[PDB]
């Protein structure tokens, strides 16, 4: 029941910039380990004994601290360092972990590529009709999609999902899916997927016509 508070939860850094992440213990702890975890893989110990480095961890990384305050510092960031870092303690039982700090990598703003897709035949043959919309490779992550059927924001009944920051170009992608019944789908005509990001004053629109 020894709480580890990591702050901030999310933070972004430009390549080459110094980076420091904090780990605050509710009660004094003698040691502290740090783990790195990238999207899709498993954690990997990054630092043991609050400040020692295991083979394979860049020297740009270093840890320090004592009592109830510990920290992980990156002297100079490289895009390869983007991941989530967890601190952990073995002083008390059980060996608690912090909630992790997600380190985002900053980069120039990039507009999203928008694609909209009408329901497929196979689906419409089961009474289903899901309209899908993809917003690929944009930055910053914060963006907002808006659905419109026959010119009216079809607000509720939408499922959105974000990918983690791309490891190659450092951007984000998202998917928006509005699910309807075959019958309600064939009852309307204009289907528009409207995306408002930081890269454009006016929203980027994309839309098919059921015909």
């Amino acid at each position: 029941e020894l709480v580890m508070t990591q702050t901030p939860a999310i933070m972004s850094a430009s390549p080459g910039e110094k980076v420091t992440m904090t780990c605050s213990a509710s009660s004094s702890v003698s040691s502290v380990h740090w783990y790195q975890q990238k999207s899709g893989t498993s954690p990997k110990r990054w630092i043991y004994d609050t400040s020692k480095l295991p083979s394979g961890v860049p020297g740009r990384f270093s840890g320090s601290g004592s009592g109830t305050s510990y920290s992980l510092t990156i002297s100079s960031m490289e895009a390869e360092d983007a991941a989530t870092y967890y601190c952990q303690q073995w002083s008390s039982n059980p060996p608690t972990f912090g909630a992790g700090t997600k380190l985002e990598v900053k980069r120039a703003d990039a507009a999203p590529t928008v694609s909209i897709f009408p329901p497929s035949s196979e689906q419409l043959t089961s009474g289903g009709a899901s309209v899908v919309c993809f917003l690929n490779n944009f930055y910053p992550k914060d963006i907002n999609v808006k659905w419109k059927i026959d010119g009216s924001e079809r607000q509720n009944g939408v499922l959105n999902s974000w990918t983690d920051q791309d490891s190659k170009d450092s951007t984000y992608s998202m998917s928006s899916t509005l699910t309807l019944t075959k019958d309600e789908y064939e009852r309307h005509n204009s289907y528009t997927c409207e995306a408002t990001h930081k890269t454009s004053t006016s929203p980027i629109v994309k839309s098919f016509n059921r015909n």
């Binding site: 110990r45 295991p54 909630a99 196979e122 899901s130 899908v132 993809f134 959105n160 990918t163």
Partner: protein, 207 residues
């Protein structure tokens, strides 16, 4: 080095069991062999370990439901968590380490639910200079599901989105971008696998 294995869906109140088969080193020679899990939300929790000798050490808050044992002869150790509840749904990893070094497995998801396995329905997403193609995988349970394009030859330019739960069923979508002059000239197919129901579907994206 380490690979985790065991059933995907386990009913509440029952027991959860996993096997970690190690290769390249005798688990009786050295290292501490741990079981660590990560809950949806990414919160981590060390569950326990067993020394090079059958001596064990468990997380106090699990002491009454957990058991870690091994089979030297087969170079594998196991994990049993009794009386599971939905709160035990997580990705289970096995690992080993000494003061200076650690090795982990790929991790294996286990869902604790009374819900029943449901195969997914794969639908193609064709367009309303590169072209963007899609593939909708919906109505399945539990996780995970795997999606590849053209059996993997089309790996780059692929954006597979995290599944979203709704009405006790997951829905997921995947996208791939290719040169306008490649599709529909060359066939682009999304391959979807859903092990919990032993499902393997292929949907050619038709214009």
């Amino acid at each position: 080095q380490l690979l985790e294995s065991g059933p995907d869906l386990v009913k509440p109140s029952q027991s959860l069991s996993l096997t970690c088969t190690v290769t390249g080193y005798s688990i009786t020679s050295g290292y501490n062999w741990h079981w660590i899990r990560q809950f949806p939300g990414n919160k981590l929790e060390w569950m326990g370990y067993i020394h090079y000798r059958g001596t064990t050490n468990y997380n106090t808050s699990l002491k009454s439901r957990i058991s870690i044992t091994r089979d030297s002869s087969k170079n594998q150790f196991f994990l049993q968590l009794n009386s599971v509840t939905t709160e035990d749904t997580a990705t289970y990893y096995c690992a080993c380490d000494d003061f200076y070094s650690d090795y982990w497995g790929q991790g294996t998801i286990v869902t604790v639910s009374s819900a029943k396995t449901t195969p997914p329905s794969v639908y193609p997403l064709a367009p309303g200079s590169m072209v963007t193609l899609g593939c909708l995988v919906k109505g399945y349970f539990p996780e995970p599901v795997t999606v590849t394009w053209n059996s993997g030859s089309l790996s780059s330019g692929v954006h597979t989105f995290p599944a979203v739960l709704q009405s006790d069923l997951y829905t997921l979508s995947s996208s791939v971008t290719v040169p306008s002059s490649t599709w529909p000239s060359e066939t682009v197919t999304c391959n979807v696998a859903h092990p919990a129901s032993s499902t393997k579907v292929d949907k050619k994206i038709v214009p």
